[model samples]
Target: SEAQRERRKRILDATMAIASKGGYEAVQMRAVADRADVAVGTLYRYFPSKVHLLVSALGREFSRIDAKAVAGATPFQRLNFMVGKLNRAMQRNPLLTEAMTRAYVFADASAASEVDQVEKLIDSMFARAMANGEPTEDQYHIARVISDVWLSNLLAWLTRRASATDVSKRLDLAVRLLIGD
Candidate 1:
């Protein structure tokens, strides 16, 4: 079991490195196999296509983000910290995030269910980062709105419709507007 999971992680890790460095265009299956040290067939067996590989890779980012310091005390403080944290991640890996966002947008029907990880990860990120890492009813409801705003703002910034500052400002305003007292 460990071996199986470890291989998956290796493959996923390699995919992230390549895609993050050079966008999805660089995630050749054989190249991923070589870096992951698995056979090409083995890589194919695990990930049928690059879209599957890279979108799946994005899920692991949340674990690392969670471990980073958010430095907020109130519910509102923590929520902004979580969104700001995600914003910074998008800013750091603009190419990576843009590539993955495009892949998700253009994904075929087979990818429909799998790509929900994008939304769920954001949902979980908000839930876990709030109120002692638990999701109250309000947290659950508001997470959806916040997540949608994030994706929208990220797309706007990527397309040059909005500036980088616009994304962060919109997220800040959305949180305050939606999560009001």
Candidate 2:
């Protein structure tokens, strides 16, 4: 059991390395298996498909962002921190980010569990970052609206309709309209 856990770690580490360097298209199952010294079927056994692997990878990345000690005291400032963190990470690996976003967008019944985890994690990130401690229903609404803005802008950027600056500005505007008054 411990050995399987270690193998999973190695596979994910290898997957992240490949994704960071070559983007999502580079994260082939065989490459991950080779890098992890596991068989192709073994990799599949661990991950039903590339989409499943990436969904987990997305969650892992989200955890890293959530782990950071947020610096701002004001709700607006903290929201900006969260938004900036998300946008910057997504921008860092545009192609890979695009692939992950696609998977999130096109997820089928098979991806329901992973997709639910990803959605709830994202929603929690907003709830924690925007509210002081206990978020109200209104706060949750704000979080969902803001989260949609972030996802929408990122998707737009991926398709060449928006630039990095565009995403940043749009997110800023979304916050302004929703909370800036």
Candidate 3:
């Protein structure tokens, strides 16, 4: 089990490193296999396609958020911190963001499982930041809604349709309306 886990992690880590450098197009299967020192067939066995690989890697990236710090502030402040931190990180890594975002956007039924995993990760992030890590049912509902809006806002930003500030403003509106006292 450890060997299996290690191989998978190595593959994912290699995927992130390649995507980090040159975006989605750079993450060729052969390249990832070579980088991870695994067989090309093994890489394919782990992830059927590039989209699956990237989406999984995206989830891995999101897992880096510090839940403790996210749960440290007021509900409103905690949410802003979570979204702001994610936004800033994406802005700083446009290529990686685009890679993951595009894969997320274009993913079809086969990738739905991976996509849902990513969405749940985001849901947990918001829920953790709400009510000091113990969100109510209503807060959970709002968190899910915000996650959808966040993705749309991210797509808008990526396409130049929405500025980073616009994303922030929209999130502010969503939080106020949905989570307000």
Candidate 4:
């Protein structure tokens, strides 16, 4: 189990490195195998396809952040935790984000389902916050609006249309506007 997990991590790390270096097109199966020092078949055994690999990778990253946020005491605290986690995650690998975003856009039906899963995860997080009773009806509506806005802002930041500071400001404004007293 340890060896299998290590191999999977190596494959995912190689994929991220390749994408960071040259976007989505650079992360071919053969290239990832070469980078991971594994065979192409071996890579396929771990991840059926590039889209599956990317979706898995993204899920891992989100899970890490989500787990951390879930450890917080309150829903508002969870929201703050998530915002910081997202900002840091995006800053950690802008290029990887860009490549992943591109992949999601050009992805086929199956891959689209993976992307939808990510959206659903965010929605669940928001619904959890609402269920915590901190958000009124108007605030809940604003939360949904902010989720979409924050996602679009992240896309722009990944594409270099916006700066990191802009993303942070956008996030701050979103939270502030949505949580007004």
Give the best candidate by lDDT: 3
Cα lDDT tens digits, model 4, 30-108, are 9999988888998987777788777767766666544661445655555665677777876787778777777665667
TM-score of each: 0.86, 0.85, 0.87, 0.69
Q: List the residue pairs that clash in candidate 3.
A: none
lDDT of 4: 0.71
Candidate 4, superposed: residue stretches over 4 Å from native: 1-6, 45-48, 68-74, 122-147, 158-160
Runs in model 2 deviating more than 4 A are: none
| Candidate 3 structure quality by residue, lDDT tens digits, 1-181 | 8998898899999999999899878989999999989999988998988898998887877787643322434677777777777777777887887788778778999888988888778777788778775778777788888877877987997799987778767887887777664
Clash pairs detected, candidate 1: none
Ranking by TM-score: 3, 1, 2, 4
lDDT of 4 at 13: 84
| TM-score result, candidate 1 | 0.86
lDDT of 2 by residue, 118-167 (tens): 77777777777778577777767888788788778778877788897887
- Residue 139, model 4: lDDT of 45
lDDT per residue as tens, model 1, 1-181: 8999999999989988898898767889999999999999988887888888877787776656656543677778888877876778778987787677667666787776657765677677787666656788778778888877767876777688988788789889988897643
CA lDDT for candidate 3: 0.81
